[PDB]
Specification:
The structure is cut from a larger assembly and holds one chain. This protein is low in regular secondary structure. The protein is about 0% helix and about 0% strand. The chain binds 5 RNA strands through loops. The PDB classes it as ribosome. The entry lists the keywords 30S ribosomal subunit, protein-RNA complex, protein-protein complex, RNA-RNA complex, ribosome. The entry is titled "Crystal structure of five 70s ribosomes from Escherichia Coli in complex with protein Y".
Length: about 90
RNA sequence: AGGGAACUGAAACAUCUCAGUACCUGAAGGAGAAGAAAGAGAAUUCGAUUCCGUUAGUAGCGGCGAGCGAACCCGGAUCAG
RNA sequence: GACUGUAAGGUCGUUGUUCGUGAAACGAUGACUGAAUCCGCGCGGACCACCGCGCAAGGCUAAAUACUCCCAGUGACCGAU
RNA sequence: AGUCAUGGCACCUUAUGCGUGUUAUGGCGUGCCUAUUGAAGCAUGAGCCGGCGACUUAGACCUGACGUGCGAGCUUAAGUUGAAAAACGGAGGCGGAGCGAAAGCGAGUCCGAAUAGGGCGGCAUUAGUACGUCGGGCUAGACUCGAAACCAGGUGAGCUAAGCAUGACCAGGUUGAAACCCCCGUGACAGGGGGCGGAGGACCGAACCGGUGCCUGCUGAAACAGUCUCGGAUGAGUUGUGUUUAGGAGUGAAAAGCUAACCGAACCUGGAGAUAGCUAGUUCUCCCCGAAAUGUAUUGAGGUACAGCCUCGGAUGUUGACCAUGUCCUGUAGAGCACUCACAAGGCUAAGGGCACGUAAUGUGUUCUAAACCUUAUGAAACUCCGAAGGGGCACGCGUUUAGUCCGGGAGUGAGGCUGCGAGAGCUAACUUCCGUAGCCGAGAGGGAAACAACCCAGACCAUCAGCUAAGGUCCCUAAAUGAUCGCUCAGUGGUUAAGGAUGUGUCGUCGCAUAGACAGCCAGGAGGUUGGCUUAGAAGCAGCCACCCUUCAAAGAGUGCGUAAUAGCUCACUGGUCGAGUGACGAUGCGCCGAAAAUGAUCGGGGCUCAAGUGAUCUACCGAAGCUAUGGAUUCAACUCGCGAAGCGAGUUGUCUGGUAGGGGAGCGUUCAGUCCGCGGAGAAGCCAUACCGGAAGGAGUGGUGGAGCCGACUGAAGUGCGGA
RNA sequence: UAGGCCCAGGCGACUGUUUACCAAAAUCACAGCACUCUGCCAACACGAACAGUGGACGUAUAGGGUGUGACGCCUGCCCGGUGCCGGAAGGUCAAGUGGAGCGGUAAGUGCAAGCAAAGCUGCGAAAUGAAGCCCCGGUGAACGGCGGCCGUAACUAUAACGGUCCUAAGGUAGCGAAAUUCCUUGUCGGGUAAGUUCCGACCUGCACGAAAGGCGUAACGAUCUGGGCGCUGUCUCAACGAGGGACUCGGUGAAAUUGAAUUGGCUGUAAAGAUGCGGCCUACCCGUAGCAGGACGAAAAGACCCCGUGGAGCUUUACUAUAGUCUGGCAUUCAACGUUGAGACGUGGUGCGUAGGAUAGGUGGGAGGCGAAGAACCCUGGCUACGGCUGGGGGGAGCCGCCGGUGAAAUACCACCCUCUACUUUUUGACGUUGUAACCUGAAAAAUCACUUUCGGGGACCGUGCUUGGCGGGUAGUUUGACUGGGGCGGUCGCCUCCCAAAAUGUAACGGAGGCGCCCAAAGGUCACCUCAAGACGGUUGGAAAUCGUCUGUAGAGCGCAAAGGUAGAAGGUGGCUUGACUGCGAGACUGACACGUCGAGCAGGGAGGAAACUCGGGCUUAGUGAACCGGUGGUACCGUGUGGAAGGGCCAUCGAUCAACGGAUAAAAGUUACCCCGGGGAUAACAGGCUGAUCUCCCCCGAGAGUCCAUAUCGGCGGGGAGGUUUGGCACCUCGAUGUCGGCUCGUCGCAUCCUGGGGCUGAAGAAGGUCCCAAGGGUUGGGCUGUUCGCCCAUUAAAGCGGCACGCGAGCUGGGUUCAGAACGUCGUGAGACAGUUCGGUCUCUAUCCGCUACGGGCGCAGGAGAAUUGAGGGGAGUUGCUCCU
RNA sequence: CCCCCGUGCCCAUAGCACUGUGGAACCACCCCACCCCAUGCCGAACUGGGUCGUGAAACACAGCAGCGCCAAUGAUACUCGGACCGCAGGGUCCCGGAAAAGUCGGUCAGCGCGGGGG
């Protein structure tokens, strides 16, 4: 194509955010937080990041994978009250 | 047989589908046309053309696109020089 | 009964075939090659090896398949714009 | 146009104050089709009558409901029979374990170094299949039609015309030139006079060819003219008839004119209907349900695909949404500020720069933002350690109901509007335009709103001149208390309107004060240093710059405003006194106005209102919806029995029975063809004209009339089965 | 009975053509000359067919195409570039010949891996080489340009002149607002008073000119403009009369069209242009004459336009076919002849591992090989990595097979294939040369064909076939993309950052800003230490700044390039070791209907750092991502239509497109119509309304400033509230089953804000006369010049010459007059066909009125017995302007 | 109940500054230096061996506001929702959730956790 001044005719662009696991919901190794398409492991989404926080959640099953370096993953040992078995 | 485009479709669009179709011209009987061959098949089988029955609506073809489409096994009229 | 019933493959350019032709023999043409010539010759989809079958050389073959000017008869059609 | 509505004349195929044939008039009320978001339109189609009135017909083209054949299943070709047939018939394919490129493998499977995974025999498993009508689709124009354009062939060119031939049309006048001849200034001889001559698309202009402009008139005379002005008229003139040229060529004065009244490539028979996402339409009457102009795709846009979005078969044995509650977050709105951009004032900042008699940085010194630290203390969509409504996630539990739960036959037509919620292009303007979120109209009526898609109230089974609620109203034209205290009250605003204003007004706080009976309307005091220095003519209280000290007396303004080049004059103010019971300047709710003057004629629906029936606060009740209860009756899904030895059917009852545009499941009226015809009709049916029984509508019914020979019936299948409207 | 007259400016030299029905003009049309070619049984035409003639029955001062068109003077610098001929060192071309070579097999071998004629086939090109593509030469009544920028004595001004860009060049005869000027109707002057006009010139002539020319230039052309001469009595009032239609009567009476009329209006309302709607007022009903505002008048479903993956038509190098035309190849072209190349048959014929009488890739036969065609031996000339190829002569009657050895082999005589050769024969591009068997042009038998009988003749040439290259719109099928806050030049077409997006997801946009389709053997993995810009302390080449020590440092660096988020325990910097930017997996997740991309503990193998630990699908990510057929290759048996290989296929992986129109879809493509036809259309423009109210006319706010000073006699820096809105429009709502600009006469009738009276406020107004404002209509408002004119200014008037009405009133009047329908000319342009609300010349124009309604006259009905006629009345209309003498 | 090397909870009701003090068991400096380790240079915080000395700012403890730092249901600002003034904002009431500064206080905590002592 070809363009100049006093006019312009250019497109625009975005993508799908798509958070996914919706907080206190079962667990397993869903996904959630496509802030970074590459992503990484997480085990158990505690809700980290800079400053005090961490998502009030606690709900064991499996690994997790989440977001970027932006906020925070989890990996915590603890189901919620459970700790012995299952 | 000499015979030859073409609106269409491919969502338009020169290979293409129509196809060898419209038309022209030559022949005879109300029958001419392929029909007994340097052949089809395929287990180391089967003979004279064509039609439809079933396959195969397969193989292939193919701006690799719509699309056209045998032989492998089959009926009878005929399984005669 | 009157007659006598037994003397061409090929190359290059291409049409077809289902094959828009190219990864393929096979009908044939445009100019060039009339070789083989018999355990020699035509091809199995180019060629190698072995098999299979057919042999330059010209036609006849009625019967069905496909047709519908006329003569009886026949169909859950119309009704004389 | 309407339907009802009291009357009104008639009749009474049953006195029975009950009806038949009807109308002044009242409520008001705008048609149908049908491509439309959208109207009732002037948006379009329509004078009527009679018919044609289309997605179907053959195709193992396929998927699927139901009934049936079979569980190990179902058949083509015609050969024999032959007014039916039919068994005989594995040509044959589909179902069948599968996977794999396939090979081949294997009840298990592609990966290679292979318990971990997607499909499969498998499997808490149908292994089925054929016939029929049928959901969509398919091979064909096969929903039809409306296009100019491409072709094969063929037909005249007597239309306008080139080329070929034989004949033809032209009354005169004017100009009257070259040739011929005698003479001559003339050697030769070029040249000069005229005579006759006879030339010239010359002259007027009849006939002859074709025409520059008005006119009548475009159903006019005629799908075609008439009146007046010209040239060709001793000629690039015209003409009778005959004739090859032609289509993708000729003719041709070139206009891109003509081939026979349109040639951007003739006509007619023929090739295909050019095909068509364009667009007109696509026929009788229906019971319960129901939408998109949002996103992804496109040489793609009012084209089309699919998905959320509808109906239906099967299903999802606890998974629904709401809530009380647990728990985590998003970080708008805003605060606030200290990394971002900029913000105001002060201290200070000039490692800063220059005005400056300097001058080894210049030691000396100065002046101002300016970076910018603190303070004072600024903004914001794209600011920071803050912070929520709301919402989601699941969980605890049941209140109404299948909410949680996929595979499929088939949709729609993609191009809307408005109020609320906020921005984008934007004089925050636009039923302009982009977006999402509730509703609304595309698919349903009203009161209010003058009548009028989204606005306040409300969405229906058909019938009753039965009741109340909300809005709207309580004066009238057409319902409903000018019933109750009272202001702005007076403009007719209230019924199109504002920045700026006028000492109009019900009512809350101060003030110098008329319980010194103040000022606001007077009598008398009304001049001295200085009448101030200065621009100087004087400016002397007043053309100017600046400035305000005291005096007679108990006090009195460096002078407002008058005259004016500038004195004189009256006075802004103070003092002795004279009736003297409150004046003047703003915030606060509520009103009228100066702006708040258009064009057809008024611009609250109208009447008309200060008996405010203009607005606001109270209290009871009414008027007042097809929204709800009563009553007969429907449709439909579910819900507690019952009547079932032959196709299934419901009262008793509760919600749904909504209205429905593309659609899903579903019933029929009847005509033609066919089955059985004992048949129905001479008192004569069928053809037709009219009478209040029933039916979900469509329609079936009672009888004559007339008419002349047949005609339809139940159980059944078939058919070009049905708009007036193209 | 019949040229109107004259001067002048624009075009054409006048007779000819025709818009067959709007339009006859400066348009084409004539000899002369300009470019030629053909140059003959000719070019060319139609004809595939040549047969045919036209050409002409001709061969040239002849004909086919192209330019202007009397005659008179003249006609040019850019050949960079389109087009033509020319020249031939050479560079680019050929399908069938093209040694070798490679790719599939196969009787050899063997232990198999593995390597073999090749009277098979592809791969494969030396070479061959005719045009054309480079150039060299030219080439203008061929196309085309005829350029730009700085200054110069004049006060200034263009100014004979300076530098240079472009060069391919690079403006002169005439005219110069003339049928090339936007910008302006230019600027001075004639004509009456005067102008978008006629001219006479000037010259800063949008973008005049050399042959589709420039000017000149008489008559003549139904071409535009100026005036006048008498007139046209057109306009003012035109006036009156006639023959015929409008009315009495007899008969005939259709078509275009259409739902339906108890069919009055307002103002309002409605997809706003309502009469059946709202609310109000109003008519005794009907007939016919007449008139246009009226139904969104009629007709073909606008044909101006847009949409339509419609058609036709023309042109251009659009993609490309193609006759035709230009070139090469063999035959109807036969022996010879000067020949470079080339194949075979024939002798045969290079070969140095010692030695073998002797220096070997040879076999069967063999008992005798050579020699009067002269044989041991010698001389001697030619290519020798030192072998060899022959003659003659010197000697003339003499040299050779077998039990020899060794060598891959023992031999000659008849053969021998290989890299390889010169001819006695044959075949083959040939260049040049005689003759005669394809052929065609001039006598004789019914005379231009057909036989042509001896025909001269020249002769392999002319040419048909299939193949090739070039040209070619001569002819053909299509594209030419689309979007679209309208056509559309421009601008847009994929991915990524958000602002605005409406605190989960969460869209748009001719709303806005930054870019890209990478980097990197390392900014990758491991282990370790180190906080960055930034100020201050004064000290170096050190007139800031670069050097260092220091505290501070919500750390303000940097981490590969927008942006957001992350950022020390550093993903940050540095540095040693070294790469899993590995493979086979993978419960459970988001993304989207599909497309699928993103997450990752853990399993399997062998590895790296590393004690171990820990990490290891290149690294912060999202932008560096990225298509199916076809093809490029090694594994792969997994096979392969006869079977075994094998043309092939798939699989492992992988490479070919600024397609940067990025879901593209083909690999494959332009312009043009005002002659158009259709499909629809204001759900797809423009001319009217319309929501709106930008700009338009008018008033409001107090203080600066005029007025001697001095706000308002009158205005008002800056700005503030709106009524109207018909100022050019923003909206695309029904109008495309179609409503045709503007203006002119006339009818005009509304409104007022008042254009001229009137009575009033003031007046910085003595009068005369005004300057602004207040109030309502009572009235009324010219003629000349041009234009189509709205407008506009020029001349005089006028009490003054209005403003907003009405789709800027209206063809159911005409007019078109401009221009805006098709013709031609100019100006620049597109290559050409062609483009312009740029300029100019002409240039048909409607239509049987039932009617609503209005100007009229009648048929009647009528308030109560029937009647001729005379009457007072609501009220419906008519219903108005003004200068000037004289007089206190 | 003593002093005290130390692991968390944590994350400014433990940032800094003022007084002083303990050293012998806690902890600093140091000493010696060639060799393990081999520091951008050296071996100084990264080095092998330890009995002087001292604890000085650095190591510890309580008092300890100069400002930080936690700092409230309470009025405001903000908000699911109801009719309204009213011009969009903005605004009345009803009316729930319910910032911040400002009001005090406190700040140099506190509990398990391995010890060298009278």
């Amino acid at each position: 194509a070809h363009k100049k001044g006093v006019g312009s005719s250019k497109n625009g662009r975005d993508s799908n955010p798509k958070y996914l696991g919706v907080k206190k919901f079962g667990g397993e190794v869903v996904k959630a937080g496509n802030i970074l398409v590459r992503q990484r492991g997480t085990k158990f989404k505690a809700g980290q990041g800079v400053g005090m926080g961490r998502d009030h959640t606690l709900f064991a099953l499996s690994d997790g994978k989440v977001v970027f370096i932006n906020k925070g993953k989890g990996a915590r040992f603890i189901s919620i009250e459970a700790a012995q078995t299952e």
